């Protein structure tokens, strides 16, 4: 659970919620987690996506093409979709397997890849970043 998330990882989740709000969405989908990871800017996830050429602009374009926006933004908390819940569950396991009791931004990105089937994965594939390529980039940047 979130007590294990690093400060940056917690911020990724908050950013995902506010990305959804600003798109007038009323759920946090995997694509909002992806946007949150890019927004966070500092962590290993942000650096992995930037180094693959995956930008806020490319992801926003694809999310608008695939999901579009709502008419009216919601207030209060915006619930996770079932797939986003699965991504966050999987992030715990990714972090443990990489030897960490904390969940950092990279483990959220790895859990997103591991789920592999939501809007974020469609976006990444459309932008030319196959999931295995993202996973390899994360591992390579951690190997430094």
């Amino acid at each position: 659970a979130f007590e294990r998330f690093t400060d940056r990882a917690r911020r990724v989740v908050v950013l995902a919620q506010e990305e959804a709000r600003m798109l007038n969405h009323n759920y946090i989908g995997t694509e909002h987690i992806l946007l949150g990871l890019i927004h966070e800017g500092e962590g290993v996830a942000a650096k992995s996506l930037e180094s693959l050429g995956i930008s806020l602009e490319g992801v926003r374009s694809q999310v608008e093409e695939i999901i579009g926006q709502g008419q009216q933004a919601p207030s209060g908390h915006i619930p996770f979709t079932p797939r986003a819940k699965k991504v966050l569950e999987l992030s715990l396991r990714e972090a443990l397997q990489l030897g960490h009791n904390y969940i950092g931004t990279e483990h959220i990105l790895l859990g997103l890849i591991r789920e592999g089937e939501g809007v974020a994965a469609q976006v990444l594939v459309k932008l030319g970043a196959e999931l295995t390529r993202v996973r390899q980039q994360v591992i390579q940047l951690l190997s430094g």
Binding site: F2, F80, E89
Partner: peptide, 7 residues
């Protein structure tokens, strides 16, 4: 945890 935000 695991409904919305940091819950």
């Amino acid at each position: 945890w695991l409904y919305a935000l940091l819950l």
